[PDB]
């Protein structure tokens, strides 16, 4: 990898626009609510605040273009948080080689106290596994959470 191309930009642009049907360019708690409502579920507004606000750098609730693409790629209420993701990978792993294996996921989870089968993890890997080698690298992790 020694050259960038605008394919990434266009992809992220559309993925945002999908949720922001309004046009103004914010993913607020009302925006979240309306989507679930149309389908056929009625959320509790308190939870809609929290689930955003953990990550949101401002802690304002109105998640613009850059603040959404933060929540997708960078993540956490920090600045250049690609490093914080690279660090999160190393906690989860017992090596850290720009990847996260299915076994490593089972370990770090079950460590708390959760005897659950691996296949349930694997379903939500090969929902959107680009590389196809039973792991989850940086690009695959983001793109799976930002599926377009």
């Amino acid at each position: 990898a020694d050259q960038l191309t605008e394919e990434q930009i266009a992809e992220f642009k559309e993925a945002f626009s999908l949720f922001d049907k309004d046009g103004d360019g914010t993913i607020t708690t009302k925006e979240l609510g309306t989507v679930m409502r149309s389908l056929g579920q009625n959320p509790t507004e308190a939870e809609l605040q929290d689930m955003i606000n953990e990550v949101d750098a401002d802690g304002n609730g109105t998640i613009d273009f850059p603040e959404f693409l933060t929540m997708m790629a960078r993540k956490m209420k920090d600045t250049d948080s690609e490093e914080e993701i690279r660090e999160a990978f190393r906690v989860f792993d017992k090596d850290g080689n720009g990847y996260i294996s299915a076994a490593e996921l089972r370990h770090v989870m079950t460590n708390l106290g959760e005897k659950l089968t691996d296949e349930e993890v694997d379903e939500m890997i090969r929902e959107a596994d680009i590389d196809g080698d039973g792991q989850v690298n940086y690009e695959e992790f983001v793109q799976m959470m930002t599926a377009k």
């Binding site: 999908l18 979240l32 989507v35 959320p43 509790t44 939870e47 809609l48 929290d50 689930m51 929902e127 959107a128 799976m144 959470m145 930002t146 599926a147 377009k148």
Partner: peptide, 28 residues
């Protein structure tokens, strides 16, 4: 009887998961 995953649905279910983790802890 799922034929193929739709990209939009994966995001929405992953957003439903965000709601779930908070709900489970804060259940008082």
């Amino acid at each position: 009887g799922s034929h193929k995953k739709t990209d939009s649905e994966v995001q929405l279910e992953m957003i439903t998961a965000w709601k779930k983790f908070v709900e489970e802890k804060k259940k008082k």
